[PDB]
Amino acid sequence: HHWGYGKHNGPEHWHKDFPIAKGERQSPVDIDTHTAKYDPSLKPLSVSYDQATSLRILNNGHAFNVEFDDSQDKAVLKGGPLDGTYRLIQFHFHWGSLDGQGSEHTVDKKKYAAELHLVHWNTKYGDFGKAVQQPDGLAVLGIFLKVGSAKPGLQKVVDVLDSIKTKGKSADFTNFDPRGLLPESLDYWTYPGSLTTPPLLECVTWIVLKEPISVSSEQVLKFRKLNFNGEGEPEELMVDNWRPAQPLKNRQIKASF
Ligand SMILES: NS(=O)(=O)c1ccc(N(CCC(=O)O)c2nc(-c3ccc(Cl)cc3)c(Cl)s2)cc1
Ligand SMILES: [Zn+2]
Structure with missing residues:
Protein backbone atom coordinates (compact mmCIF):
# COMPACT_ATOMS: atom_id res chain seq x y z
CA HIS A 1 0.00 0.00 0.00
CA HIS A 2 2.59 2.56 -1.24
CA TRP A 3 1.86 6.19 -2.01
CA GLY A 4 0.41 7.38 -5.21
CA TYR A 5 -2.27 9.61 -6.63
CA GLY A 6 -5.16 7.15 -6.56
CA LYS A 7 -8.38 7.00 -4.71
CA HIS A 8 -6.77 5.64 -1.50
CA ASN A 9 -3.03 6.59 -1.42
CA GLY A 10 -3.01 10.15 -2.68
CA PRO A 11 -1.69 13.40 -1.30
CA GLU A 12 -4.05 13.57 1.64
CA HIS A 13 -2.60 10.29 2.91
CA TRP A 14 1.15 11.01 2.47
CA HIS A 15 1.59 12.44 5.93
CA LYS A 16 1.17 9.06 7.57
CA ASP A 17 4.37 7.68 5.93
CA PHE A 18 6.07 11.13 5.49
CA PRO A 19 5.23 13.37 8.45
CA ILE A 20 7.12 16.31 6.82
CA ALA A 21 4.08 16.57 4.54
CA LYS A 22 2.66 18.92 7.21
CA GLY A 23 6.02 20.84 7.43
CA GLU A 24 6.91 24.46 7.34
CA ARG A 25 8.13 24.68 3.76
CA GLN A 26 6.03 22.32 1.65
CA SER A 27 5.40 22.61 -2.06
CA PRO A 28 3.59 23.37 -4.28
CA VAL A 29 1.93 26.64 -3.27
CA ASP A 30 -0.45 29.09 -4.81
CA ILE A 31 1.43 32.13 -6.13
CA ASP A 32 -0.56 35.24 -5.21
CA THR A 33 0.81 37.53 -7.83
CA HIS A 34 -0.31 40.69 -6.10
CA THR A 35 1.49 39.72 -2.75
CA ALA A 36 4.71 38.50 -4.40
CA LYS A 37 7.34 41.04 -3.83
CA TYR A 38 9.48 42.35 -6.66
CA ASP A 39 13.08 41.94 -5.55
CA PRO A 40 15.46 44.16 -7.58
CA SER A 41 18.36 42.18 -5.94
CA LEU A 42 17.26 39.04 -7.92
CA LYS A 43 19.46 38.23 -10.88
CA PRO A 44 18.45 37.00 -14.32
CA LEU A 45 18.28 33.31 -14.39
CA SER A 46 21.18 31.59 -16.20
CA VAL A 47 20.09 28.52 -17.99
CA SER A 48 23.03 26.80 -19.78
CA TYR A 49 21.74 23.74 -21.49
CA ASP A 50 23.85 23.76 -24.76
CA GLN A 51 25.94 20.82 -23.54
CA ALA A 52 23.06 18.77 -22.09
CA THR A 53 23.31 14.96 -22.47
CA SER A 54 20.04 13.23 -22.25
CA LEU A 55 20.29 9.51 -21.77
CA ARG A 56 17.07 7.70 -21.05
CA ILE A 57 13.37 8.12 -20.43
CA LEU A 58 11.72 6.13 -17.64
CA ASN A 59 8.16 5.49 -16.48
CA ASN A 60 8.66 5.39 -12.70
CA GLY A 61 5.06 4.63 -11.91
CA HIS A 62 4.26 8.25 -10.94
CA ALA A 63 5.38 10.22 -14.03
CA PHE A 64 8.05 9.84 -16.69
CA ASN A 65 11.54 11.16 -16.20
CA VAL A 66 13.93 12.26 -18.94
CA GLU A 67 17.34 11.60 -17.36
CA PHE A 68 20.56 13.40 -18.10
CA ASP A 69 24.31 12.90 -17.59
CA ASP A 70 25.02 14.78 -14.54
CA SER A 71 28.60 13.40 -14.00
CA GLN A 72 30.12 16.68 -15.43
CA ASP A 73 29.42 20.37 -15.58
CA LYS A 74 26.93 20.12 -18.45
CA ALA A 75 23.47 21.57 -18.27
CA VAL A 76 23.47 23.90 -15.35
CA LEU A 77 21.26 26.44 -13.72
CA LYS A 78 22.73 29.42 -11.89
CA GLY A 79 22.01 33.03 -11.19
CA GLY A 80 18.43 33.91 -10.33
CA PRO A 81 18.10 33.50 -6.59
CA LEU A 82 20.84 30.82 -6.49
CA ASP A 83 24.29 30.82 -4.99
CA GLY A 84 26.63 28.56 -6.99
CA THR A 85 25.98 25.91 -9.68
CA TYR A 86 23.11 23.45 -9.98
CA ARG A 87 23.37 20.60 -12.44
CA LEU A 88 20.40 19.20 -14.38
CA ILE A 89 19.66 15.58 -13.47
CA GLN A 90 16.17 15.01 -14.94
CA PHE A 91 12.95 16.58 -16.00
CA HIS A 92 9.39 15.32 -15.65
CA PHE A 93 5.80 16.62 -15.71
CA HIS A 94 2.67 16.64 -13.68
CA TRP A 95 -0.66 16.70 -15.54
CA GLY A 96 -4.34 16.28 -15.25
CA SER A 97 -7.14 14.17 -16.55
CA SER A 170 12.61 2.65 -19.99
CA ALA A 171 13.87 3.69 -23.43
CA ASP A 172 17.05 5.16 -24.76
CA PHE A 173 16.56 8.88 -25.14
CA THR A 174 19.68 10.59 -26.41
CA ASN A 175 20.27 13.96 -27.96
CA PHE A 176 17.12 15.56 -26.56
CA ASP A 177 17.62 19.33 -26.18
CA PRO A 178 15.66 20.70 -23.19
CA ARG A 179 16.09 24.25 -24.54
CA GLY A 180 13.14 23.48 -26.78
CA LEU A 181 10.89 23.30 -23.66
CA LEU A 182 11.60 26.88 -22.48
CA PRO A 183 9.30 29.88 -23.04
CA GLU A 184 10.68 33.14 -24.39
CA SER A 185 10.88 34.99 -21.12
CA LEU A 186 12.81 33.86 -18.00
CA ASP A 187 10.90 36.06 -15.65
CA TYR A 188 10.19 34.12 -12.49
CA TRP A 189 8.84 33.76 -8.98
CA THR A 190 10.95 32.11 -6.33
CA TYR A 191 10.46 30.70 -2.83
CA PRO A 192 11.95 27.98 -0.53
CA GLY A 193 10.03 24.72 -0.59
CA SER A 194 10.10 21.01 -0.96
CA LEU A 195 9.89 18.01 -3.24
CA THR A 196 6.26 17.61 -4.25
CA THR A 197 6.34 13.84 -4.03
CA PRO A 198 7.48 11.62 -1.16
CA PRO A 199 9.92 11.89 0.54
CA LEU A 200 8.72 15.53 0.50
CA LEU A 201 12.13 16.75 1.71
CA GLU A 202 12.49 20.48 2.36
CA CYS A 203 15.51 20.93 0.06
CA VAL A 204 14.25 22.93 -2.93
CA THR A 205 14.66 26.49 -4.14
CA TRP A 206 11.68 26.76 -6.42
CA ILE A 207 11.99 28.94 -9.53
CA VAL A 208 8.62 29.13 -11.35
CA LEU A 209 8.54 30.88 -14.75
CA LYS A 210 5.76 33.35 -15.30
CA GLU A 211 5.34 32.69 -19.02
CA PRO A 212 3.70 29.26 -19.74
CA ILE A 213 4.57 27.17 -22.79
CA SER A 214 1.88 26.03 -25.22
CA VAL A 215 1.40 22.44 -26.05
CA SER A 216 -1.33 20.95 -28.21
CA SER A 217 -4.30 18.91 -27.03
CA GLU A 218 -2.86 15.99 -28.90
CA GLN A 219 0.44 16.24 -27.04
CA VAL A 220 -1.15 16.27 -23.57
CA LEU A 221 -3.62 13.57 -24.64
CA LYS A 222 -0.61 11.35 -25.24
CA PHE A 223 0.66 12.02 -21.70
CA ARG A 224 -2.72 10.78 -20.49
CA LYS A 225 -2.26 7.41 -22.28
CA LEU A 226 0.55 6.45 -19.94
CA ASN A 227 -0.15 4.04 -17.17
CA PHE A 228 0.62 4.05 -13.42
CA ASN A 229 0.50 0.22 -13.33
CA GLY A 230 3.03 -2.35 -14.50
CA GLU A 231 2.47 -4.46 -17.57
CA GLY A 232 0.04 -7.31 -16.93
CA GLU A 233 -1.67 -5.40 -14.13
CA PRO A 234 -5.11 -3.72 -14.41
CA GLU A 235 -4.82 -0.51 -16.45
CA GLU A 236 -4.74 2.77 -14.46
CA LEU A 237 -4.27 5.84 -16.60
CA MET A 238 -1.41 8.13 -15.50
CA VAL A 239 -3.45 11.25 -14.93
CA ASP A 240 -3.81 13.73 -12.02
CA ASN A 241 -0.29 13.10 -10.77
CA TRP A 242 -0.15 16.51 -9.06
CA ARG A 243 -0.06 17.50 -5.40
CA PRO A 244 -2.45 20.37 -4.61
CA ALA A 245 -1.20 23.71 -3.16
CA GLN A 246 0.05 23.57 0.40
CA PRO A 247 0.00 26.30 3.09
CA LEU A 248 2.53 29.05 2.46
CA LYS A 249 3.17 29.50 6.25
CA ASN A 250 6.05 31.72 7.05
CA ARG A 251 7.28 32.26 3.43
CA GLN A 252 7.60 35.11 0.99
CA ILE A 253 7.41 34.53 -2.73
CA LYS A 254 9.71 36.96 -4.64
CA ALA A 255 9.31 38.10 -8.23
CA SER A 256 12.15 38.82 -10.57
CA PHE A 257 10.01 41.29 -12.50
N1 LIG B 1 8.20 16.91 -8.32
S1 LIG B 1 9.70 17.35 -7.77
O1 LIG B 1 9.67 17.92 -6.43
O2 LIG B 1 10.41 18.10 -8.81
C1 LIG B 1 10.67 15.86 -7.58
C2 LIG B 1 12.02 15.87 -8.00
C3 LIG B 1 12.74 14.66 -7.82
C4 LIG B 1 12.22 13.51 -7.35
N2 LIG B 1 13.02 12.30 -7.28
C5 LIG B 1 12.99 11.38 -8.39
C6 LIG B 1 12.03 10.21 -7.95
C7 LIG B 1 11.80 8.96 -8.81
O3 LIG B 1 12.08 8.95 -9.99
O4 LIG B 1 11.22 7.85 -8.30
C8 LIG B 1 13.63 12.02 -6.10
N3 LIG B 1 14.46 10.98 -5.98
C9 LIG B 1 15.00 10.99 -4.74
C10 LIG B 1 15.94 9.90 -4.32
C11 LIG B 1 17.02 10.20 -3.46
C12 LIG B 1 17.87 9.16 -3.06
C13 LIG B 1 17.70 7.88 -3.60
CL1 LIG B 1 18.79 6.60 -3.13
C14 LIG B 1 16.66 7.55 -4.49
C15 LIG B 1 15.79 8.61 -4.87
C16 LIG B 1 14.50 11.98 -3.90
CL2 LIG B 1 14.83 12.24 -2.27
S2 LIG B 1 13.48 12.98 -4.75
C17 LIG B 1 10.85 13.51 -6.95
C18 LIG B 1 10.11 14.70 -7.03
ZN1 LIG C 1 7.74 17.37 -10.07
Whole structure:
Protein backbone atom coordinates (compact mmCIF):
# COMPACT_ATOMS: atom_id res chain seq x y z
CA HIS A 1 0.00 0.00 0.00
CA HIS A 2 2.59 2.56 -1.24
CA TRP A 3 1.86 6.19 -2.01
CA GLY A 4 0.41 7.38 -5.21
CA TYR A 5 -2.27 9.61 -6.63
CA GLY A 6 -5.16 7.15 -6.56
CA LYS A 7 -8.38 7.00 -4.71
CA HIS A 8 -6.77 5.64 -1.50
CA ASN A 9 -3.03 6.59 -1.42
CA GLY A 10 -3.01 10.15 -2.68
CA PRO A 11 -1.69 13.40 -1.30
CA GLU A 12 -4.05 13.57 1.64
CA HIS A 13 -2.60 10.29 2.91
CA TRP A 14 1.15 11.01 2.47
CA HIS A 15 1.59 12.44 5.93
CA LYS A 16 1.17 9.06 7.57
CA ASP A 17 4.37 7.68 5.93
CA PHE A 18 6.07 11.13 5.49
CA PRO A 19 5.23 13.37 8.45
CA ILE A 20 7.12 16.31 6.82
CA ALA A 21 4.08 16.57 4.54
CA LYS A 22 2.66 18.92 7.21
CA GLY A 23 6.02 20.84 7.43
CA GLU A 24 6.91 24.46 7.34
CA ARG A 25 8.13 24.68 3.76
CA GLN A 26 6.03 22.32 1.65
CA SER A 27 5.40 22.61 -2.06
CA PRO A 28 3.59 23.37 -4.28
CA VAL A 29 1.93 26.64 -3.27
CA ASP A 30 -0.45 29.09 -4.81
CA ILE A 31 1.43 32.13 -6.13
CA ASP A 32 -0.56 35.24 -5.21
CA THR A 33 0.81 37.53 -7.83
CA HIS A 34 -0.31 40.69 -6.10
CA THR A 35 1.49 39.72 -2.75
CA ALA A 36 4.71 38.50 -4.40
CA LYS A 37 7.34 41.04 -3.83
CA TYR A 38 9.48 42.35 -6.66
CA ASP A 39 13.08 41.94 -5.55
CA PRO A 40 15.46 44.16 -7.58
CA SER A 41 18.36 42.18 -5.94
CA LEU A 42 17.26 39.04 -7.92
CA LYS A 43 19.46 38.23 -10.88
CA PRO A 44 18.45 37.00 -14.32
CA LEU A 45 18.28 33.31 -14.39
CA SER A 46 21.18 31.59 -16.20
CA VAL A 47 20.09 28.52 -17.99
CA SER A 48 23.03 26.80 -19.78
CA TYR A 49 21.74 23.74 -21.49
CA ASP A 50 23.85 23.76 -24.76
CA GLN A 51 25.94 20.82 -23.54
CA ALA A 52 23.06 18.77 -22.09
CA THR A 53 23.31 14.96 -22.47
CA SER A 54 20.04 13.23 -22.25
CA LEU A 55 20.29 9.51 -21.77
CA ARG A 56 17.07 7.70 -21.05
CA ILE A 57 13.37 8.12 -20.43
CA LEU A 58 11.72 6.13 -17.64
CA ASN A 59 8.16 5.49 -16.48
CA ASN A 60 8.66 5.39 -12.70
CA GLY A 61 5.06 4.63 -11.91
CA HIS A 62 4.26 8.25 -10.94
CA ALA A 63 5.38 10.22 -14.03
CA PHE A 64 8.05 9.84 -16.69
CA ASN A 65 11.54 11.16 -16.20
CA VAL A 66 13.93 12.26 -18.94
CA GLU A 67 17.34 11.60 -17.36
CA PHE A 68 20.56 13.40 -18.10
CA ASP A 69 24.31 12.90 -17.59
CA ASP A 70 25.02 14.78 -14.54
CA SER A 71 28.60 13.40 -14.00
CA GLN A 72 30.12 16.68 -15.43
CA ASP A 73 29.42 20.37 -15.58
CA LYS A 74 26.93 20.12 -18.45
CA ALA A 75 23.47 21.57 -18.27
CA VAL A 76 23.47 23.90 -15.35
CA LEU A 77 21.26 26.44 -13.72
CA LYS A 78 22.73 29.42 -11.89
CA GLY A 79 22.01 33.03 -11.19
CA GLY A 80 18.43 33.91 -10.33
CA PRO A 81 18.10 33.50 -6.59
CA LEU A 82 20.84 30.82 -6.49
CA ASP A 83 24.29 30.82 -4.99
CA GLY A 84 26.63 28.56 -6.99
CA THR A 85 25.98 25.91 -9.68
CA TYR A 86 23.11 23.45 -9.98
CA ARG A 87 23.37 20.60 -12.44
CA LEU A 88 20.40 19.20 -14.38
CA ILE A 89 19.66 15.58 -13.47
CA GLN A 90 16.17 15.01 -14.94
CA PHE A 91 12.95 16.58 -16.00
CA HIS A 92 9.39 15.32 -15.65
CA PHE A 93 5.80 16.62 -15.71
CA HIS A 94 2.67 16.64 -13.68
CA TRP A 95 -0.66 16.70 -15.54
CA GLY A 96 -4.34 16.28 -15.25
CA SER A 97 -7.14 14.17 -16.55
CA LEU A 98 -8.68 17.27 -18.12
CA ASP A 99 -7.17 20.50 -19.45
CA GLY A 100 -8.49 22.49 -16.51
CA GLN A 101 -6.17 20.86 -13.96
CA GLY A 102 -2.73 19.28 -13.72
CA SER A 103 -0.31 21.90 -12.49
CA GLU A 104 1.10 21.76 -8.94
CA HIS A 105 1.76 25.39 -8.48
CA THR A 106 -1.17 27.73 -9.18
CA VAL A 107 -1.18 31.41 -10.04
CA ASP A 108 -3.91 33.39 -8.33
CA LYS A 109 -5.63 29.97 -7.96
CA LYS A 110 -5.37 29.32 -11.69
CA LYS A 111 -4.49 25.67 -12.49
CA TYR A 112 -2.62 25.01 -15.75
CA ALA A 113 -3.00 21.78 -17.79
CA ALA A 114 0.43 20.56 -16.72
CA GLU A 115 3.72 21.65 -15.15
CA LEU A 116 7.26 20.75 -16.24
CA HIS A 117 9.94 20.33 -13.49
CA LEU A 118 13.59 20.61 -14.51
CA VAL A 119 15.41 19.20 -11.44
CA HIS A 120 18.91 20.38 -10.59
CA TRP A 121 21.25 19.69 -7.67
CA ASN A 122 23.78 21.89 -5.97
CA THR A 123 27.26 20.92 -7.01
CA LYS A 124 28.55 21.90 -3.57
CA TYR A 125 27.05 18.58 -2.27
CA GLY A 126 28.69 16.32 -4.82
CA ASP A 127 25.68 14.36 -6.05
CA PHE A 128 21.86 14.36 -5.94
CA GLY A 129 21.32 11.97 -3.01
CA LYS A 130 23.42 14.08 -0.69
CA ALA A 131 21.88 17.30 -2.04
CA VAL A 132 18.37 16.31 -1.05
CA GLN A 133 19.48 16.28 2.57
CA GLN A 134 20.29 19.99 2.50
CA PRO A 135 18.12 23.10 2.64
CA ASP A 136 19.71 24.53 -0.49
CA GLY A 137 20.28 21.14 -2.14
CA LEU A 138 18.07 21.47 -5.21
CA ALA A 139 16.76 24.04 -7.62
CA VAL A 140 13.66 23.06 -9.56
CA LEU A 141 12.67 25.10 -12.53
CA GLY A 142 8.93 24.90 -12.96
CA ILE A 143 7.23 25.82 -16.25
CA PHE A 144 3.51 25.81 -16.77
CA LEU A 145 1.85 24.20 -19.81
CA LYS A 146 -1.32 25.51 -21.38
CA VAL A 147 -3.22 23.81 -24.21
CA GLY A 148 -3.09 25.69 -27.57
CA SER A 149 -0.50 25.51 -30.33
CA ALA A 150 1.89 22.50 -30.25
CA LYS A 151 5.32 22.72 -28.70
CA PRO A 152 7.52 21.34 -31.51
CA GLY A 153 10.42 20.79 -29.00
CA LEU A 154 8.15 18.47 -26.98
CA GLN A 155 7.17 16.09 -29.76
CA LYS A 156 10.25 13.86 -29.50
CA VAL A 157 9.16 13.15 -25.87
CA VAL A 158 5.53 12.62 -26.84
CA ASP A 159 6.40 10.14 -29.53
CA VAL A 160 8.50 7.80 -27.29
CA LEU A 161 5.78 7.48 -24.66
CA ASP A 162 4.13 4.48 -26.29
CA SER A 163 7.47 2.61 -25.65
CA ILE A 164 7.27 3.31 -21.88
CA LYS A 165 3.54 2.87 -21.29
CA THR A 166 3.76 1.07 -18.00
CA LYS A 167 5.61 1.33 -14.72
CA GLY A 168 9.24 0.22 -14.88
CA LYS A 169 9.65 0.63 -18.66
CA SER A 170 12.61 2.65 -19.99
CA ALA A 171 13.87 3.69 -23.43
CA ASP A 172 17.05 5.16 -24.76
CA PHE A 173 16.56 8.88 -25.14
CA THR A 174 19.68 10.59 -26.41
CA ASN A 175 20.27 13.96 -27.96
CA PHE A 176 17.12 15.56 -26.56
CA ASP A 177 17.62 19.33 -26.18
CA PRO A 178 15.66 20.70 -23.19
CA ARG A 179 16.09 24.25 -24.54
CA GLY A 180 13.14 23.48 -26.78
CA LEU A 181 10.89 23.30 -23.66
CA LEU A 182 11.60 26.88 -22.48
CA PRO A 183 9.30 29.88 -23.04
CA GLU A 184 10.68 33.14 -24.39
CA SER A 185 10.88 34.99 -21.12
CA LEU A 186 12.81 33.86 -18.00
CA ASP A 187 10.90 36.06 -15.65
CA TYR A 188 10.19 34.12 -12.49
CA TRP A 189 8.84 33.76 -8.98
CA THR A 190 10.95 32.11 -6.33
CA TYR A 191 10.46 30.70 -2.83
CA PRO A 192 11.95 27.98 -0.53
CA GLY A 193 10.03 24.72 -0.59
CA SER A 194 10.10 21.01 -0.96
CA LEU A 195 9.89 18.01 -3.24
CA THR A 196 6.26 17.61 -4.25
CA THR A 197 6.34 13.84 -4.03
CA PRO A 198 7.48 11.62 -1.16
CA PRO A 199 9.92 11.89 0.54
CA LEU A 200 8.72 15.53 0.50
CA LEU A 201 12.13 16.75 1.71
CA GLU A 202 12.49 20.48 2.36
CA CYS A 203 15.51 20.93 0.06
CA VAL A 204 14.25 22.93 -2.93
CA THR A 205 14.66 26.49 -4.14
CA TRP A 206 11.68 26.76 -6.42
CA ILE A 207 11.99 28.94 -9.53
CA VAL A 208 8.62 29.13 -11.35
CA LEU A 209 8.54 30.88 -14.75
CA LYS A 210 5.76 33.35 -15.30
CA GLU A 211 5.34 32.69 -19.02
CA PRO A 212 3.70 29.26 -19.74
CA ILE A 213 4.57 27.17 -22.79
CA SER A 214 1.88 26.03 -25.22
CA VAL A 215 1.40 22.44 -26.05
CA SER A 216 -1.33 20.95 -28.21
CA SER A 217 -4.30 18.91 -27.03
CA GLU A 218 -2.86 15.99 -28.90
CA GLN A 219 0.44 16.24 -27.04
CA VAL A 220 -1.15 16.27 -23.57
CA LEU A 221 -3.62 13.57 -24.64
CA LYS A 222 -0.61 11.35 -25.24
CA PHE A 223 0.66 12.02 -21.70
CA ARG A 224 -2.72 10.78 -20.49
CA LYS A 225 -2.26 7.41 -22.28
CA LEU A 226 0.55 6.45 -19.94
CA ASN A 227 -0.15 4.04 -17.17
CA PHE A 228 0.62 4.05 -13.42
CA ASN A 229 0.50 0.22 -13.33
CA GLY A 230 3.03 -2.35 -14.50
CA GLU A 231 2.47 -4.46 -17.57
CA GLY A 232 0.04 -7.31 -16.93
CA GLU A 233 -1.67 -5.40 -14.13
CA PRO A 234 -5.11 -3.72 -14.41
CA GLU A 235 -4.82 -0.51 -16.45
CA GLU A 236 -4.74 2.77 -14.46
CA LEU A 237 -4.27 5.84 -16.60
CA MET A 238 -1.41 8.13 -15.50
CA VAL A 239 -3.45 11.25 -14.93
CA ASP A 240 -3.81 13.73 -12.02
CA ASN A 241 -0.29 13.10 -10.77
CA TRP A 242 -0.15 16.51 -9.06
CA ARG A 243 -0.06 17.50 -5.40
CA PRO A 244 -2.45 20.37 -4.61
CA ALA A 245 -1.20 23.71 -3.16
CA GLN A 246 0.05 23.57 0.40
CA PRO A 247 0.00 26.30 3.09
CA LEU A 248 2.53 29.05 2.46
CA LYS A 249 3.17 29.50 6.25
CA ASN A 250 6.05 31.72 7.05
CA ARG A 251 7.28 32.26 3.43
CA GLN A 252 7.60 35.11 0.99
CA ILE A 253 7.41 34.53 -2.73
CA LYS A 254 9.71 36.96 -4.64
CA ALA A 255 9.31 38.10 -8.23
CA SER A 256 12.15 38.82 -10.57
CA PHE A 257 10.01 41.29 -12.50
N1 LIG B 1 8.20 16.91 -8.32
S1 LIG B 1 9.70 17.35 -7.77
O1 LIG B 1 9.67 17.92 -6.43
O2 LIG B 1 10.41 18.10 -8.81
C1 LIG B 1 10.67 15.86 -7.58
C2 LIG B 1 12.02 15.87 -8.00
C3 LIG B 1 12.74 14.66 -7.82
C4 LIG B 1 12.22 13.51 -7.35
N2 LIG B 1 13.02 12.30 -7.28
C5 LIG B 1 12.99 11.38 -8.39
C6 LIG B 1 12.03 10.21 -7.95
C7 LIG B 1 11.80 8.96 -8.81
O3 LIG B 1 12.08 8.95 -9.99
O4 LIG B 1 11.22 7.85 -8.30
C8 LIG B 1 13.63 12.02 -6.10
N3 LIG B 1 14.46 10.98 -5.98
C9 LIG B 1 15.00 10.99 -4.74
C10 LIG B 1 15.94 9.90 -4.32
C11 LIG B 1 17.02 10.20 -3.46
C12 LIG B 1 17.87 9.16 -3.06
C13 LIG B 1 17.70 7.88 -3.60
CL1 LIG B 1 18.79 6.60 -3.13
C14 LIG B 1 16.66 7.55 -4.49
C15 LIG B 1 15.79 8.61 -4.87
C16 LIG B 1 14.50 11.98 -3.90
CL2 LIG B 1 14.83 12.24 -2.27
S2 LIG B 1 13.48 12.98 -4.75
C17 LIG B 1 10.85 13.51 -6.95
C18 LIG B 1 10.11 14.70 -7.03
ZN1 LIG C 1 7.74 17.37 -10.07
